[PDB]
């Protein structure tokens, strides 16, 4: 079992970012390696469909507490679902899960196309828009509504800005950065005004519709028959749409790649079934989750070493989502490739991979890419625009993933047939 050798490797981790582990793989030759980071803690990282079946084999891999506590006090919040295993998480997933149906997820679509569309007039009358800034705030919107919480037009763009402090929390991979106490108190705020809500709906003074996210959650009881408590209820409830939210990140890159292969545009335009693989191609090509801890339960045998009881495992999320193996030209944006692409659940796993019931795997895909499809959809059809020149880099070697302006767009105008 071969090493990146050192005390703690962070630093290392941070200053080469989404390429820190290819770069290990490449130089020690192998498809498996152990580092120690995150305050010593040794972690072996499995890539690739292999790593990601065995990431998700319950039986070998825990996944409690293995998320580093600043991470869970800013990005996801003390006792939400990404922080239990067994029956609690089972039991708790199943109430993410039946917000997922059919009608439920067609409600976003017409939201957000809704939304965009009404969008145009605002977006034609500023000098230029900042679209990642734009979308986050239309998507706050999008994600207060489908959650059947009602924030006032008034209050979005405060929302939204916290929502975003939030996201961005996972930058230090758990150390100390300067805008940790900013995220606690941006958490604070969205997590007291959630409160409220559950509090108010629990008490019958506010009469959310059946079916969404405040009521299912609020009058939800677990396996023995106990309601969440009123806090972690609004900590769950927030993990029901502050990643929604986070689409944003998606939208900005969504751009960039049609701006770079204006070709994807026209077939976005001419090609029904396109949206969709455009969509998955973002998600696939762009870089936003790292990768994934856990924590080996027994020995595990794996690619030829055996992976001790008791030591970390990193799943690495950007290194399959780029295996050369798996994916022919990896770091080449191609939505064709989807056309072929048989839905495996261990090689596209760029929000998690293994089952939605079982596994902790992301319980917004589907609002994910439907999201990605009308928004792009919008964006490649019903305006035209003008790309001015900025900085367009998306540094690889820097956590989290962003285009470094935003994506800045101007002379946005309607695309209407008057004749
Ligand atoms: C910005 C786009 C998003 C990304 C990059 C993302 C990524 C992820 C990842 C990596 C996980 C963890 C998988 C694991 O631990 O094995 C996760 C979990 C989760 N995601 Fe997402 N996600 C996104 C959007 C969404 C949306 C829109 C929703 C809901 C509307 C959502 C709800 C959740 C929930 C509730 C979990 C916890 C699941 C569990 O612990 O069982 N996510 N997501």
Redesign the pocket.
């Known amino acids: 079992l071969k090493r990146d050798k050192g005390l703690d490797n962070t630093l290392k981790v941070l200053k080469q970012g989404y390429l820190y582990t290819t770069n290990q793989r490449n130089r020690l030759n192998t498809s498996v390696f152990q580092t120690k980071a995150l305050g010593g803690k040794p972690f072996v990282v499995v890539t690739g469909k292999e790593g990601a079946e065995m990431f998700?084999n319950n039986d070998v891999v825990q996944?409690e507490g293995m998320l580093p506590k600043r991470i869970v006090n800013t990005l996801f919040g003390k006792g939400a679902?990404?922080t239990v295993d067994g029956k609690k998480?089972v039991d708790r997933?199943a109430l993410?899960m039946s917000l997922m149906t059919e009608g439920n997820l067609n409600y976003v679509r017409e939201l957000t196309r809704t939304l965009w569309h009404a969008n145009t007039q605002r977006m034609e009358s500023m000098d230029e828009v900042n679209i990642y800034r734009e979308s986050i705030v239309l998507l706050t919107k999008v994600?207060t509504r489908w959650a059947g919480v009602q924030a006032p037009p008034e209050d979005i763009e405060r929302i939204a800005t916290d929502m975003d402090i939030m996201?961005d929390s996972f930058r230090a991979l758990g150390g100390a950065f300067k805008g940790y106490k900013a995220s606690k108190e941006a958490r604070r705020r969205v997590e007291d005004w959630l409160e409220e809500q559950i509090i108010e709906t629990r008490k019958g003074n506010i009469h959310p519709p059946e079916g969404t996210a405040l009521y299912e959650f609020a009058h939800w009881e677990d396996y023995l028959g106990n309601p969440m408590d009123s806090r972690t209820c609004a900590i769950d409830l927030m993990?029901?749409?502050r990643?929604?939210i986070?689409?944003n990140?998606?939208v900005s890159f969504g751009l960039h790649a049609m701006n770079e292969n204006p070709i994807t545009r026209e077939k976005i335009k001419s090609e029904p079934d396109y949206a969709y693989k455009f969509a998955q191609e973002v998600?696939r090509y762009y870089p936003?989750?790292p990768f994934?801890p856990g924590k080996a339960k027994v020995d595990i045998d794996f690619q030829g070493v055996t992976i001790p009881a008791g030591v970390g495992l990193a799943?690495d999320?950007y290194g399959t989502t780029h295996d050369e193996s798996l994916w022919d030209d990896p770091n080449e944006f191609r939505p064709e490739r989807f056309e072929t692409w048989d839905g495996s659940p261990f090689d596209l796993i760029?929000?998690?991979?293994?089952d939605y019931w079982t596994?902790?795997?992301?319980?917004?895909?589907w609002?994910?890419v439907i999201?990605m499809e009308e928004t792009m959809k919008y964006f490649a059809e019903k305006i035209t625009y003008d790309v001015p020149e900025q900085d367009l880099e998306v540094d690889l070697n820097s956590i989290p993933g962003y285009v470094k302006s935003g994506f800045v767009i101007k002379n946005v105008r309607e695309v209407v047939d008057r004749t």
């Open positions: 998700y996944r679902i990404h998480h997933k993410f994600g996201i993990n029901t749409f990643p929604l986070a689409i990140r998606f998600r936003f989750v994934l799943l999320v760029p929000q998690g991979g293994g596994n902790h795997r992301c319980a917004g895909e609002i994910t999201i």
